[PDB]
Amino acid sequence: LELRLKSPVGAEPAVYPWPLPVYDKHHDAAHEIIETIRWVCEEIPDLKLAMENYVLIDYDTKSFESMQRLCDKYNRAIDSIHQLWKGTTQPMKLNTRPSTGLLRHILQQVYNHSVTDPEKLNNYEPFSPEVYGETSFDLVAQMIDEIKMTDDDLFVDLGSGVGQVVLQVAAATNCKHHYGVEKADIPAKYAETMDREFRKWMKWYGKKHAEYTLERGDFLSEEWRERIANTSVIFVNNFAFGPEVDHQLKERFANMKEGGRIVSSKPFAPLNFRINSRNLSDIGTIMRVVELSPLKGSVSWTGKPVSYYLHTIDRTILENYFSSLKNP
Amino acid sequence: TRKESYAIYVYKVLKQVHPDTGISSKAMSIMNSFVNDVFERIAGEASRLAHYNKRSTITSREIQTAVRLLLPGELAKHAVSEGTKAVTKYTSAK
Amino acid sequence: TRKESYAIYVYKVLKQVHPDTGISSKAMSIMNSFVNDVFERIAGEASRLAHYNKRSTITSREIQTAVRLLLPGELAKHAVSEGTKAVTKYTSAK
Amino acid sequence: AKTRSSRAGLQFPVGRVHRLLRKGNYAERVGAGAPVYLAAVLEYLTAEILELAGNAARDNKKTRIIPRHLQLAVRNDEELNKLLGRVTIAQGGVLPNIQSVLLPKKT
Amino acid sequence: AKTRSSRAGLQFPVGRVHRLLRKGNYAERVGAGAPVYLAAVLEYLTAEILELAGNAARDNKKTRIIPRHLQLAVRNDEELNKLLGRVTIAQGGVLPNIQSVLLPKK
Amino acid sequence: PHRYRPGTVALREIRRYQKSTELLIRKLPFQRLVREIAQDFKTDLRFQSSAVMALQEASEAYLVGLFEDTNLCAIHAKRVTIMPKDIQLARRIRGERA
Amino acid sequence: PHRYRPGTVALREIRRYQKSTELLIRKLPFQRLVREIAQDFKTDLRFQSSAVMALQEASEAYLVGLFEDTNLCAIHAKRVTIMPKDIQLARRIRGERA
Amino acid sequence: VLRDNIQGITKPAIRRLARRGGVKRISGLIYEETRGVLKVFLENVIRDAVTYTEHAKRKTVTAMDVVYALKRQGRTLYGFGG
Amino acid sequence: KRHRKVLRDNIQGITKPAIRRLARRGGVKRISGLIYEETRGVLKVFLENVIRDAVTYTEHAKRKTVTAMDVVYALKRQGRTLYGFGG
DNA sequence: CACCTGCAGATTCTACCAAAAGTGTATTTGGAAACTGCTCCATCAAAAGGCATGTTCAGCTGAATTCAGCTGAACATGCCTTTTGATGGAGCAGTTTCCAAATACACTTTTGGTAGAATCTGC
DNA sequence: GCAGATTCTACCAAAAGTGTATTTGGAAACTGCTCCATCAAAAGGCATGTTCAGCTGAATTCAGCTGAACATGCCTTTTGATGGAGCAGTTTCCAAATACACTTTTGGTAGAATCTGCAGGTG
Numbered sequence A: 001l002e003l004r005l006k007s008p009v010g011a012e013p014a015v016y017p018w019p020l021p022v023y024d025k026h027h028d029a030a031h032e033i034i035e036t037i038r039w040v041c042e043e044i045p046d047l048k049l050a051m052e053n054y055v056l057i058d059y060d061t062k063s064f065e066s067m068q069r070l071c072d073k074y075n076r077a078i079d080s081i082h083q084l085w086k087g088t089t090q091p092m093k094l095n096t097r098p099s100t101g102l103l104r105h106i107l108q109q110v111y112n113h114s115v116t117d118p119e120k121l122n123n124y125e126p127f128s129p130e131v132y133g134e135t136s137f138d139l140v141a142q143m144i145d146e147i148k149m150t151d152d153d154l155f156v157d158l159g160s161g162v163g164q165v166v167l168q169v170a171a172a173t174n175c176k177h178h179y180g181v182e183k184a185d186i187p188a189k190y191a192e193t194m195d196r197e198f199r200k201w202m203k204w205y206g207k208k209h210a211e212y213t214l215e216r217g218d219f220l221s222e223e224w225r226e227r228i229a230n231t232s233v234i235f236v237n238n239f240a241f242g243p244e245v246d247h248q249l250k251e252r253f254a255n256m257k258e259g260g261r262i263v264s265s266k267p268f269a270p271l272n273f274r275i276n277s278r279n280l281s282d283i284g285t286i287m288r289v290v291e292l293s294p295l296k297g298s299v300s301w302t303g304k305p306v307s308y309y310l311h312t313i314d315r316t317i318l319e320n321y322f323s324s325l326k327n328p
Numbered sequence B, C: 001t002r003k004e005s006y007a008i009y010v011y012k013v014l015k016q017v018h019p020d021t022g023i024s025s026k027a028m029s030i031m032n033s034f035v036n037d038v039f040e041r042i043a044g045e046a047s048r049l050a051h052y053n054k055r056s057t058i059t060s061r062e063i064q065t066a067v068r069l070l071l072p073g074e075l076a077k078h079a080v081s082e083g084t085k086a087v088t089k090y091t092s093a094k
Numbered sequence D: 001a002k003t004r005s006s007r008a009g010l011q012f013p014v015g016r017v018h019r020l021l022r023k024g025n026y027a028e029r030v031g032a033g034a035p036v037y038l039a040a041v042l043e044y045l046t047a048e049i050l051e052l053a054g055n056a057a058r059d060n061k062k063t064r065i066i067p068r069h070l071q072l073a074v075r076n077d078e079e080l081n082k083l084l085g086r087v088t089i090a091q092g093g094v095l096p097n098i099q100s101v102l103l104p105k106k107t
Numbered sequence E: 001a002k003t004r005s006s007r008a009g010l011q012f013p014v015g016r017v018h019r020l021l022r023k024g025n026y027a028e029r030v031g032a033g034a035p036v037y038l039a040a041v042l043e044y045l046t047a048e049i050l051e052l053a054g055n056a057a058r059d060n061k062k063t064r065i066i067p068r069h070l071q072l073a074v075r076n077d078e079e080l081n082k083l084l085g086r087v088t089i090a091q092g093g094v095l096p097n098i099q100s101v102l103l104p105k106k
Numbered sequence F, G: 001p002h003r004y005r006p007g008t009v010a011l012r013e014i015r016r017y018q019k020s021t022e023l024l025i026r027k028l029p030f031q032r033l034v035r036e037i038a039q040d041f042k043t044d045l046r047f048q049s050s051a052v053m054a055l056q057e058a059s060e061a062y063l064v065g066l067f068e069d070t071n072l073c074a075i076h077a078k079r080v081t082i083m084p085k086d087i088q089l090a091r092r093i094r095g096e097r098a
Numbered sequence H: 001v002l003r004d005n006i007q008g009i010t011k012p013a014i015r016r017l018a019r020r021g022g023v024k025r026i027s028g029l030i031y032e033e034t035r036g037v038l039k040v041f042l043e044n045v046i047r048d049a050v051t052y053t054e055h056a057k058r059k060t061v062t063a064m065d066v067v068y069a070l071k072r073q074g075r076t077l078y079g080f081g082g
Numbered sequence I: 001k002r003h004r005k006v007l008r009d010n011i012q013g014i015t016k017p018a019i020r021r022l023a024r025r026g027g028v029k030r031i032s033g034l035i036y037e038e039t040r041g042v043l044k045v046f047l048e049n050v051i052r053d054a055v056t057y058t059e060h061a062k063r064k065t066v067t068a069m070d071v072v073y074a075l076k077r078q079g080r081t082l083y084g085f086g087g
Numbered sequence J: 001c002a003c004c005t006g007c008a009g010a011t012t013c014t015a016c017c018a019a020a021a022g023t024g025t026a027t028t029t030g031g032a033a034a035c036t037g038c039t040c041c042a043t044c045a046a047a048a049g050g051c052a053t054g055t056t057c058a059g060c061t062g063a064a065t066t067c068a069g070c071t072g073a074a075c076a077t078g079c080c081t082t083t084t085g086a087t088g089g090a091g092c093a094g095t096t097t098c099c100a101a102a103t104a105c106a107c108t109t110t111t112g113g114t115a116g117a118a119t120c121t122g123c
Numbered sequence K: 001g002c003a004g005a006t007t008c009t010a011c012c013a014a015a016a017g018t019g020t021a022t023t024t025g026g027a028a029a030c031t032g033c034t035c036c037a038t039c040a041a042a043a044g045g046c047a048t049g050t051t052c053a054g055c056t057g058a059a060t061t062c063a064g065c066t067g068a069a070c071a072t073g074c075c076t077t078t079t080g081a082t083g084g085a086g087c088a089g090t091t092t093c094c095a096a097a098t099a100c101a102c103t104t105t106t107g108g109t110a111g112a113a114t115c116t117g118c119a120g121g122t123g
């Protein structure tokens, strides 16, 4: 028939059809069922005790019966917790921040339900701006922790893909607004469905999120020059978009107000920035650069570690150039 | 007999990147070896390439392919842009 | 379009050395690769030798030095004697 | 008049490079754009190595680039290290690198 | 007219070797003896390998030289092995060789 | 139920494969692997048949010789079992890692 | 009387020499070795002084890099002491004796 | 049942290669390590071969493109032309 | 020209401390007593090979003086390209 | 390791210029471009020859322990390399002369490569 | 028995060899001049040789457990047959590359003069 996993708070349950839909050769409906159940067990002590009953750890992905005895144990366990939650125990608070293992899982659940065919997004020829966005969880966590977000800030993702980075930042840190703009029609279209689904799923799990918009647009345009300058936290994914594009994005980080931070996967100027007598076209005349630690557990398809590079707008660099020229 | 070297051109470039930095004669000798080395490597790859394709002419297209064959990833990308740009500009000036 | 190879000459040599021994197609292709490979190594070495010495001409002397640089001991000695012998014989003939 | 280097916007000598290509016996003919493209690449690679070597010199509180700085620049840069993987820079020394198991104590 | 090969007493083609040298862009000029000397060297090396290869075919009870025999001849010959130290002979296999420590303790 | 001791058959296989020259990876799977890698450099490519075979002859000769060096490294550490660290040591010294 | 433990000064020496670039073999003795060897190849040769320095820079770079590989071979065998068998394995994998 | 292509280089095929290489006993982890090594080898050689293919304005990788690629990588191969 | 001392056993000029220093630059912490002679033997082969080719270039040019360039070319031929001496 | 003095090596000018490099007509031609025939490559069907998987235990790897003696650290002694200089002259390298040998066609001859047909033979 | 090597006839653009005339690289000849070999003298940076014992390599023992051998069963690979994607052979044609005579600019470099980064010693 179907398989149903009911909400711990009594939002609206998640329904998974039988036969099980497959999204790709690495993600199927069955694996989403198993992951929900682990993470709910981790949030609610009592739930996991009730998952101890009957047969446990002999379920398998496919076989109606094997997954239904697990689902059915969970649905009974949810009911019990809801009766209990009317009592001395109270609902799972929606001001409690998510933990990193749980947050990763909420985006994974959400992702599969917005994007019903991710392999297609993965066909790109390297060296163009059509190159589909999205970043590993670890990298984005490195950004969130090191480069603080405050509620006097504005977060923007140029080349956001499906907008999962923005979402992750908005549940884990607060800001005035959190945004995603993506150029290529297919991943951006999905970015809207992600924003809505993400909000439904954050309530469902009883956890806190901020306020965010994933927008469909073009991040390689004139309008977005002004958006970037009045923004103070820019995450931008680029490296595999070509030198041509790297130039045009650089020009737009130039428009940025003093104080602004740019977190990128592209070293726009050398780490150890030295003066040029033609840095009237080079972005490094207006920024301090340092390269953030490579993280292992985020390797590419050539098997290379992904870095991010922290660039900080500082006009002292510029002030010094000019003074050296005024002399003699 | 006059003996040529890329020294003055290496110096001009040094001054563009690091205005107040000098270079010892031994380092300049190393830079001159480097330039000659890469010139020969690229020229030889270009020569073979042209021969393999039964072409008697080495054009910027053979230099570009030689550069791609010889240089590691990111260096090849940037070298390619700089050479392409230099030729497009060169051809626009006459 | 003609496809030249050393096959017929390798075969003549085979008959001199082993009159009743044949050679398969794949083996012959290996021998053709061998001859082309040694030809290129020797020729390239001779080319570099002449350029190093600012000479426009590759003569039997550059071929000889190239052989001594490229081939291991005994092989070089016999190759040199074979080469010298052929140029002598050749030079003495109306 | 104007040099072919100025027309191409280069610091490296296009004329010289064209000449060297002809004298090197690389092909019967060498097109006009070949030396331009090649001079540009050589210039770019030299800019890259000098950028990094001057930084190594600065790191070592020196104003003059010496062979050691060229070596630190090349060996600390993945791509230049590969391009010069079979090249020895005289008076370059090596990168400080002591295998872990050789250090004393524990933890 | 007598071929340059016959005059040199060679089986390898002097004329072709001269031509290949000229068009290989090795030098602006190529002297008359160069292609003769080079052809003779190529002939000699060829005879050396075929000599040892043929012997290997014989030891294997075969009258036709196949790649395996060229590999056995080259790898069992110290000098040829070094000359061809960075060359792979297709369908050559390797020399029979088991590290002693791997043999059973009889 | 007859049973050869561990190693007896291994030794038998070494002798057998060192006597022959046929390729040891199956052709189609190798071809698929080759095409997939090439598609990342240029889409819609075709391959002459001899091109794939040359790649396989070269790839197999490379791995076989690498296994020989790997084996010397395992033996150097007084083992007779090759491990990943043996392949890594060999590649580093060959300068493929260095 | 004070004494550093064995290995302490060795580590100090490693840091010192990896920081510098001067040649480590005495110059005249190396020049005599070059002349002796060259003389056995061909009598009555003369040498430009930079030709001998070039041979020395190349010989030392070669030896330092070989000791790095040798060291990796000793460590591979769970030792910290390099031995002739480590140099031999390193040269064999490099194809210097293969 | 699906199958990742590099997984098509099977444990038995790898063991045979190892046997010709004189190897008597193999660690379970060797197979994946070998696959990784083989992929890097093919990526390096194929990249150059395709570079020659494209320079020739062809859509077909020829044996010669491969031979030239192997040769510049110091892996000269005899038997396929050149 | 009168006399010219006989050169012999100069491989011993490559002393134990010099070899120890070279191994330290190579990151080596402990050294077996047999390493010194082994290293001399390896250095002799290296030098014989490079010097043989260098002198071959010297003779070809009909010179009696081995130049820095004869060595640079010999090193290059052997895949040991050296920068800094005109090469 | 920041500060400070003596100095070799480096960046600072003057004048000379042959070797470059560039500007200007004439003449030549390599190879892009378009059309197209002939391979031989991609793909499908089915006859065909391993590979995947779980079981059992032999024997290998590596941990724990011990200790002989190698090899590092420190030291005394003084040899020989290094440094600073000078000098004869071997020989490398510049300059001019000038032929033996190479390039440059033009023409006649032979020859290796290709295509098709059919018989032969090592394995 | 048969896939692949061998034998034979026929076709011909491609080569290669011969003949003729011009062009030229680089040898011998003479010689300027760098720099190589060598002798001298002084002295201190290091090599040598020894003592002593820390701790490393090498041996021995042993048990957990990983890999080898193997039996059991089917799915991916191999083999043989067939439309076309393009690799090539052919023809056409000009943008662009030699060839060649001047004219102008510039990188070397010989010699003398003043500058300046940092080696080297100190605390």
Ligand SMILES: C[S@@+](CC[C@H](N)C(=O)[O-])C[C@H]1O[C@@H](n2cnc3c(N)ncnc32)[C@H](O)[C@@H]1O
Residues within 6 Å of the ligand: A129, A130, A131, A132, A133, A134, A135, A136, A157, A158, A159, A160, A161, A162, A165, A181, A182, A183, A184, A187, A217, A218, A219, A220, A221, A237, A238
């Ligand atoms: C590497 S993808 C981003 C993936 C996602 N941001 C992440 O970090 O995983 C880069 C994105 O930049 C987008 N892009 C490029 N130029 C743009 C432009 N001018 N305006 C908006 N988006 C642009 C592309 O469409 C592409 O999806």
